Amino acid sequence: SAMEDFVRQCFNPMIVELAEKAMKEYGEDPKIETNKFAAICTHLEVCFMYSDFGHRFEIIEGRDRIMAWTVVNSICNTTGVEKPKFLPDLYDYKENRFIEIGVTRREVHIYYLEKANKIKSEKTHIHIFSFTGEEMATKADYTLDEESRARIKTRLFTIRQEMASRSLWDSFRQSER
Ligand SMILES: [Mn+2]
Ligand SMILES: [Mn+2]
């Protein structure tokens, strides 16, 4: 598929490898679930950019479940912050709170409501990004400075435009995988 080629050309090999590992966890094949492949790569890249724009942030996404829960447990033991139900994406040492990052091809408020209804934890901060430069965060607290968020928005829009140039955007956005 052209989607796999695009993924291997636009994403660095480490992100592609982690995404393939996550698909093995899912028991899914990157050559069949190509849109899920692109979405997982995009979410990983956004989480890594978010963490690098700070060390203010502890990365939880991208680790295997053992190490992710080990990191979450150590953070909870040191800070006393409540342990989340689901594995979040980041921990913010400055605000002392876990962060769930969302990347959606739909409207940001719809996805925000979906994520907030899932996580059921007022403590965990939510930050949603779209491929159109829109964002939505808990209490309108965007955590990052405007420059870092602009970098993330530019990266997402560029991914959307590369997909559209390769005639892949319609399939990707119409899919919720
Ligand atoms: Mn995650
Ligand atoms: Mn996430």
From Swiss-Prot:
Residues the record lists as binding Mn(2+) 1: 43, 61, 89, 100-101
Location in the cell: Host cytoplasm; Host nucleus
Phenotypic consequence of residue 40 to T: RO-7 resistant, reduced affinity for Baloxavir and Baloxavir marboxil
PTM notes: Phosphorylated on serines and threonines by host kinases, including human casein kinase II.
Residues at the catalytic site: 115
Described purpose of this protein according to its UniProt entry: Plays an essential role in viral RNA transcription and replication by forming the heterotrimeric polymerase complex together with PB1 and PB2 subunits. The complex transcribes viral mRNAs by using a unique mechanism called cap-snatching. It consists in the hijacking and cleavage of host capped pre-mRNAs. These short capped RNAs are then used as primers for viral mRNAs. The PB2 subunit is responsible for the binding of the 5' cap of cellular pre-mRNAs which are subsequently cleaved after 10-13 nucleotides by the PA subunit that carries the endonuclease activity.
Family per similarity comment: Belongs to the influenza viruses PA family.
Record protein name field: Polymerase acidic protein
Higher taxonomy: Viruses, Riboviria, Orthornavirae, Negarnaviricota, Polyploviricotina
